[PDB]
RNA sequence: AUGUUUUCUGUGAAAACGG
């Protein structure tokens, strides 16, 4: 038994909660364009330069974004296991978008996809229509949606 | 409290500032 925003409530929260963050639908398009923006041609970067160059391009519109907030947003990415992660003796570790992530269409499913199996965990039911919502401000992707929930289950 | 920030090699940890 639960209402609208009794779910969203719950769901940024379960988010927060794995160090993980959601800053709308807008600004997340951005930052996941800058991630790519970063990390198409095979660069690898440390979570730091790489948290970096994303909060310098994207504070000229977005100025609330930090290291932090970017931080989470990386963090996420990394749950959904899209970067190829490559140690270096007490040295920050190398990151890398692994080459199926390498489109923008291929990681914003990946990073959505996430956020839904963060909801399963934490037993969310939530229908596509309220999802297009959450994600991207309107009705638009529903189907997209839809297509996520279906390929998880 | 709701938040916000900071550090870090994090399917994550540890803190600080609001009040």
């Known amino acids: 038994h639960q209402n609208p925003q009794q779910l969203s409530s719950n769901l940024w929260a379960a988010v927060r909660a794995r160090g993980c ?5 807008a600004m997340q398009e951005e930052a996941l364009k800058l ?6 041609d095979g660069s ?3 979570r730091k330069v790489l948290v970096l160059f ?6 000229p519109r977005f100025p609330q974004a930090s290291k932090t907030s970017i931080g989470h947003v990386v963090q996420l990415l990394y749950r959904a296991s899209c970067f190829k ?3 270096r003796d007490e040295d ?4 890398q978008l692994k080459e199926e ?3 923008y269409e291929a990681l914003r499913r990946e990073h959505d996809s996430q956020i839904v199996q963060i909801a399963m965990e934490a037993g969310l039911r939530i229908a596509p229509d309220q999802w297009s919502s959450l994600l991207y401000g309107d009705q638009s ?7 996520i929930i279906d390929k998880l289950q």
Request: net charge positive.
């Open 35 to 40: 991630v790519l923006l970063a990390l198409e």
């Open 44 to 46: 690898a970067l440390s």
């Open 21 to 25: 963050q959601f800053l709308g639908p």
């Open 101 to 103: 992530f390498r489109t």
């Open 92 to 95: 920050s570790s190398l990151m």
């Open 141 to 147: 992707h529903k189907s997209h949606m839809q297509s």
């Open 54 to 59: 994303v909060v310098q391009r994207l504070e």
């Open 85 to 87: 992660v490559t140690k």
